[PDB]
């Protein structure tokens, strides 16, 4: 369900503006973010990741959830991708670096 090459800068935004309907640009700009700050810290566990992004979205009435849960990685390393300009050479060291996770085999 979505790879990685498909996960562009600005893919998360687009997601919540089309599901949850915000008009503004940096409303999405700080939930993108938001969201985002939230799965590199709760990649540890994914039981504890649920129970912040099921209040951020508003609960059920929105949820949500399962989609990010599934896309948690794929998103934070996808978008990380396609930010860096100028500077990416430095971020295509860290990639390597943090190798923890498994192996998101995907070339350009």
Not at 35 to 46: A, G, K, Q
Not at 60 to 67: G, H, K, M, Q, R
Not at 80 to 93: D, M, V
Request: hydrophobic share 40%; net charge negative; glycine share 2%.
């Amino acid at each position: 369900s979505v790879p990685i090459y498909s996960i562009d800068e600005f893919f998360l935004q687009r997601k919540l503006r089309s599901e949850l309907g915000y008009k503004d640009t940096s409303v999405i700009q700080d939930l993108s973010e938001k969201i985002l700050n939230d799965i590199e810290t709760l990649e540890h566990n994914p039981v504890a990741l649920e129970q912040k992004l099921v209040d951020l979205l508003k609960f059920e009435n929105i949820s949500l959830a399962e989609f990010i849960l599934k896309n948690r990685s794929t998103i934070f390393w996808g978008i990380r991708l396609a930010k860096s300009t100028e500077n990416e050479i430095p971020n295509l060291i860290e990639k390597m670096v943090a190798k923890g996770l498994n192996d998101l085999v995907e070339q350009y």
